[PDB]
Design a protein around this ligand. Sequence first.
Ligand code: PLP
Ligand code: PLP
Lengths: 399, 399
Amino acid sequence: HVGTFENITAAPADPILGLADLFRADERPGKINLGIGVYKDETGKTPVLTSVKKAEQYLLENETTKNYLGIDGIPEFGRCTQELLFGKGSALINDKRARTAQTPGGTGALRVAADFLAKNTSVKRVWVSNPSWPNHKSVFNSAGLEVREYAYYDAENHTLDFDALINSLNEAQAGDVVLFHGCCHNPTGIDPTLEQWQTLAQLSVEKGWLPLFDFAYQGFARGLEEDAEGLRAFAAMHKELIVASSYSKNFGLYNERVGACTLVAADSETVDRAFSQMKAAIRANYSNPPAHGASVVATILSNDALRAIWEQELTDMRQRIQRMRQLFVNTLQEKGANRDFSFIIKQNGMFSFSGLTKEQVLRLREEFGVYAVASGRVNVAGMTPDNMAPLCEAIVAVL
Amino acid sequence: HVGTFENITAAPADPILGLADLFRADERPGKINLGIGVYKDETGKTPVLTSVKKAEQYLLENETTKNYLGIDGIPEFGRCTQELLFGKGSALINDKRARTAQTPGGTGALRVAADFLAKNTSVKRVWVSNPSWPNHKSVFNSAGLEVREYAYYDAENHTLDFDALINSLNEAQAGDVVLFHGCCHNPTGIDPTLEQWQTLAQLSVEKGWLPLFDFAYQGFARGLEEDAEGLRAFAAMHKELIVASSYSKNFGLYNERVGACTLVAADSETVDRAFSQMKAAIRANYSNPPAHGASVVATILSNDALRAIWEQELTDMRQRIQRMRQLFVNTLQEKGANRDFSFIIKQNGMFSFSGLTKEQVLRLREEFGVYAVASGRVNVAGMTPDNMAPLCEAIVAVL
Ligand SMILES: *Cc1c(COP(=O)(O)O)cnc(C)c1O
Ligand SMILES: *Cc1c(COP(=O)(O)O)cnc(C)c1O
């Protein structure tokens, strides 16, 4: 008998995670990693946060069992998540209109939402910004949903093309899903203003879209509450919406897989009925979620002393990134760059489109050992005072 | 505009995991939970293993980052898994014919296999035993695969109906998947003898089946090496197979979601090509796996001192369950049962497949506060010297 595996074609490498493999194998001591969206401190390391180490020590000494969690995970984790998203005292919470499942990362929350939609509703299409995180299309396609693109970025002016966005979204039908990044758009770092969020919200209710927010960077633009203003404007108007959030980055808990999928419906009866099918889709995927990382998050957010430490550590990360953006722009001019790079200062989060071509990005890797994503996305949080000069010298050399 | 969630039909509660909610709600003193397949010690608790606590302390002291794992997880965890399944010195390992991905539990391993098969192969059908773990059908159906049932249990003699198993797999075609439980069949506790495994291995290769082993209880039947004899008989004859394994039960790590999906192909070039598509399926689901639980397992298995402690803790679990099986049968007799329950002594693993009707299971719950699965599956590892007498008085009353 001829093998079931014999004719499988090899998959292409992941445009983000495959870069990490290349970078690890590179033997040059001066190599610089500006690819995957992981925070680095001023020393070039990705430490465990102190708030997280303290919570892990508490868990080690007080955990008495590893018995399965419920399908939807730790109850306090879900309550804390809804407060962060919608704010204490939200009507969504007091009206009992939201349900939250703890999930393995924000990616797991996206896939659970996608599986839930494909198997229990009439949804067929998901609209995603052009550009967006490369894995969005793969997640939704693998659940059986079609992915469509709406305009977003003006590469000439390095801004949000708001007229193009609205014009292209006038093709999205009632009952389509439209995906928004909550803040720190990946990869452009360009977010709507509050006014623009409010225009999109009113339009959304008018056209009958089902909003789906990918919220992986709460706290990295302006602040925890400020970064949720856009979501909270949608939540004020809509009967229905979905939020896939991640604690990977704002808690530095990447590899423990901590995220949440939050369902909102018009009333308590409908959301409980829908959440019953969300739980069924989870059960047929990974059964129930991993406890360690989510237990850490719930411990930190439940304890005023740990939460105050964590909030300061998040502010420090946010502010260090802002300092590197300015240093990056200033150092490019000193190293001989002709172009104006000041638009970098206007972008939020870890990421920015550098304006570099695929050929230039390739040269940076092969000739200078500087690793960026082929789209020209660079991770500013991977820049340090010590690697800024060689990094900038390399960019000027390929311009 | 009509809501997207209005037309949703509620899902029923899980036949196993829903029991926890029903049991927690029950206010009657002395209620007994014989439902979900977790181990309990002599005091009715599910403690963290000492070997696990020691490993967690080492990780707390030595972890310096939570940076993402690769898509397939901790390399050392994969190597230790293959040695455990196939044996040190296995030709499958020496010839590099196996690749392993760390997954979120055994369930996650089954789902990754299902998504991989549906996307990349001509597999259309999966054969599972009647009875089986109820979530098998849900996992494979979630990828759009047809699930058929083969005969397995002789409810009259409380044995394996080997003639009917053979006859009922007659219509399983080349390229169909046939799912086998590695040991401690869930729910029956009846496993093939070595002679029966060898017969099935030869038949499988003559008919061209793709075997898939679900290995959730290695070490709970007779021992770690002994429980793998059937898989190793298959592995000696087959070019291709898949193993989904779990460390939830034999390490007591249920809620940290520690499992593995192992792919075996004819040669290194083929398995690497197929594995690249399995990694693609993981990336579009939960991206990469949770570190904490798998790090514990890898630490324990790669340290001779910790591994010896763990192997003794697993022996202690196995022996307590065997003692309770015998006490259960003796006490049923003491309490006046006229039905012969001696077949329970011949079953393996955490459970006894008692033959009680759905009607009798509902009556135990509602009238005596004793909780079993509606198939009549009872968790022997939930029995203690303190609850055995009332448990048996209740069963005798509904007979
Ligand atoms: C990081 C990221 C994710 C994935 O989050 P994980 O928790 O690592 O799975 C999803 N969407 C966006 C935009 C991200 O930046
Ligand atoms: C427990 C069990 C599983 C699931 O294991 P998890 O690690 O909890 O996902 C799968 N198959 C069988 C037969 C089981 O008994």
